[model samples]
Target: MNVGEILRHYAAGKRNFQHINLQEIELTNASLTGADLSYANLHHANLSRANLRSADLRNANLSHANLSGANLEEANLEAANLRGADLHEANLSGADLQEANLTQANLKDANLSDANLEQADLAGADLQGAVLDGANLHGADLNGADLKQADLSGADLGGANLNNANLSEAMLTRANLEQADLSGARTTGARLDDADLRGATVDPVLWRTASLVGARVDVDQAVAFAAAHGLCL
Candidate 1:
């Protein structure tokens, strides 16, 4: 279907195109409110600034899609393929992205507050300045992700893999990181007040940050790392 037809279908709430193959289509600025796009193949599509509020996009293939500035509030994106999707400035508040493949996605400045991203793959994703307040990111893979200046207040990151991730200036206040991996991750200027880091990994750089806060560390590892840094912790 052409972009005009697709927009008309969405505006009319057409179910005829449900699970249809619209992959790589340019639906930018389309109004798709309440549309049932479940299982649709929108891979590599340009959907920037589209209105997708309350849309059923579950299990859809949106990998590499340009979703910058899109409105995805309350959308059901569970198990969706979003790897490498650009979600910059997109509004995803309360959206369900459970188990979504968001690896290498660009989410800079995106509004993901209250989103359900449980077990999502965010490896290498750029989440700088993104709003993640109250988001459920339990067991999410954030390895090597850029989270600089991101707001993660009250977010549940329990069991999340943050290994090698950049959290510079990120606000993690009151966030839960219980058992989350922080090995070799950069935490420069990161806020962790009232956070749970039990069993979380920490390398030498993070050790210095902990030391500044008078935080406790693994005795064996701390001793070794401290000696290497020429300090006693």
Candidate 2:
């Protein structure tokens, strides 16, 4: 159908097209782009890339709270349990998840811009294609997390337990890793440009394989890294 007709369909609150396949041609412009959520029986639906910052349905019976094409910009997830939920490819900007239990969840390609997750648990969580542009994660446990191709630019991960995490191919530009434990984390094919490594527990091997075109380092880290490699005083 034409875009004009589909919008009329959306304005009428029909079915679950909000998170369906709109990629048949040039259909991503709409189709649940701003759909409402009142599916009293719409459990386990994939909301891959929907715009969800508007509308309000405070009472629904979505059992899994799962999504991938779902727009969650206007949903109230307070007292929510997303332990086994899926919010992949959705932008969760400015969301507060302080001390949240996300030990083993899927957040691949997730955009959690300016969110708060102080003291949260993210051990073994999939962080592929995830971007945390500006957020606070102090005292967070992210050990064994998959940070491949992740974007953590400008975020402050102070005191975060990121030991042994796979940060390969990840973007940590302008991030404040101060006092964070990045011990034994892989940095192969990673971008550490403008990274603040002050007082953080890091390894020379990680930096050795990183892209540090314009990084911020510590007095000790500079000297130590330079001396360890090829710099002389």
Candidate 3:
């Protein structure tokens, strides 16, 4: 269907567009607020600068779509296929992105505060300078992801996989990272003050590179942790 035709129906109060095939559609800057597009095939679609606030995109295939500068606040995007999608600077605050496949997506400088990204696969995604304060990222896979200068304060990241991820200068104050894997991850100049890393496994280099003032590393492992860093308890 044509963009105008679909939008005309939208204007006519047709909110249910589930399972529609809208691949490569140019809907840039369009207003599709609160629309139900669940399970839609939007691959390569141009949704840049679009107003998609509170839209239902669950299980939708939006792979490689242009969603830069879109307003996706409070949207239900659970399990959506957003692989390699351009979400740069998008406002996704409070969005339900649980189990979403955002692999290699461009999320630089995006606002994802309070978003539910639990179990989401963000592997190799660019999240540089993103705001994720208070976001729920429990069990999320961030393998090889670039998170430079991101604000993740107070975020729940328990059991998250940060393997080989770049967290240079990222803010992780007061965040919950219990049992998370930081293996081979680069935390250069990253702040972990008051962060909870109980049962977390980190690179031996992290004990020296990242700031850990008040960080709650497992108390029982402190002695062995220090020994691994060539220091005696």
Give the alpha-carbon lDDT of every model.
0.86, 0.68, 0.95
After superposition, which runs of candidate 3 have C-alpha atoms over 4 Å from their true positions? Answer: none
For 1-233, candidate 1 gives per-residue lDDT tens digits of: 66778877656768556688888888878888778888889889999999999889998999999999999999999999998999999999999999989999999999999999999999999999899999999999999999999999889998999999999888887788777898878888888776766566666677556323423335565475577677755
By lDDT, the better pick of 1 and 3 is 3
Error of 3 at 96 (Å): 0.3
149: Cα error in model 3, Å: 0.2
lDDT of 2 by residue, 140-207 (tens): 88998999999888887889999989899988888878788988898899888887878888887866
TM-score of each: 0.90, 0.69, 0.97
The all-Cα superposition gives candidate 1 an RMSD in Å to the true structure of: 2.6
Instruction: By lDDT, rank the candidates, best first.
Output: 3, 1, 2
lDDT: worst 10-residue window of model 3: 217-226
In the predicted model 2, the residue pairs found to clash are: 18-32, 47-68, 47-69, 47-70, 48-68, 48-69, 49-69, 52-71, 52-73, 53-73
- Report residue 187 deviation for candidate 1 (angstroms): 0.5
- The C-alpha local distance difference test score for the whole of candidate 1 amounts to 0.86
Question: Stretches of candidate 2 above 4 Å error?
Answer: 1-65, 74-80, 230-233
CA deviation > 4 Å runs, candidate 1: 210-233
Give the best candidate by lDDT. 3
All-Cα superposition RMSD per candidate: 2.6, 7.4, 1.2
